[PDB]
Amino acid sequence: DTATLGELAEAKGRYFGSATDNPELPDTQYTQILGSEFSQITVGNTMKWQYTEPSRGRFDYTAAEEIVDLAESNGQSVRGHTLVWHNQLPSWVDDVPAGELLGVMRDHITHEVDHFKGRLIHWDVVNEAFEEDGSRRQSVFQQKIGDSYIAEAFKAARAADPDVKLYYNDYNIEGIGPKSDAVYEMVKSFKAQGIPIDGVGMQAHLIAGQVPASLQENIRRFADLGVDVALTELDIRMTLPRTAAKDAQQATDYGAVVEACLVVSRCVGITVWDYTDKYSWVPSVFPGQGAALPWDEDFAKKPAYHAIAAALN
Binding site for Zn ion (CB under 5 A): 60, 62, 65, 69, 107, 181, 296, 298, 300
- Report CA 254 to chain centroid distance, whole Å: 17
What SS3 class is residue 187? helix
Contact indicator for 95, 136 with CB cutoff of 8 Å: no
293 DSSP 8-state letter: S
Pick from 66, 16, 61: nearest CA to 41: 16
The nearest distance, CB 60 to Zn ion, in angstroms, is: 4
Distance between CA atoms of residues 110 and 163, nearest Å: 14
The nearest distance, CB 106 to Zn ion, in angstroms, is: 9
Residue whose CB is less far from Zn ion, 95 or 298: 298
- 241: cis peptide before it, omega within 30°? yes
Q: Is the dihedral of CA 126, 132, 136, 138 positive or negative?
A: negative
Q: Which residues pair with 43 in a beta bridge?
A: 20
Distance between CA atoms of residues 290 and 131, nearest Å: 24
CA distances for 149 relative to 191, 197, 231, angstroms: 16, 14, 24
The nearest distance, CB 57 to Zn ion, in angstroms, is: 7
Is residue 128 part of the annotated active site? The answer reads yes
Residue whose CB is less far from Zn ion, 167 or 184: 184
Is residue 217 part of the annotated active site? The answer reads no
Distance between CA atoms of residues 276 and 299, nearest Å: 6
Q: Which of 112, 128, 152, 174 is catalytic?
A: 128
The nearest distance, CB 214 to Zn ion, in angstroms, is: 10
CA distances for 135 relative to 138, 192, 197, angstroms: 9, 20, 20
Vertex 264 angle, CA 260 and 266, to 5° = 130
Q: Which of 37, 112, 152, 233 is catalytic?
A: 233
Distance between CA atoms of residues 8 and 226, nearest Å: 26
Active site amino acids:
128, 233
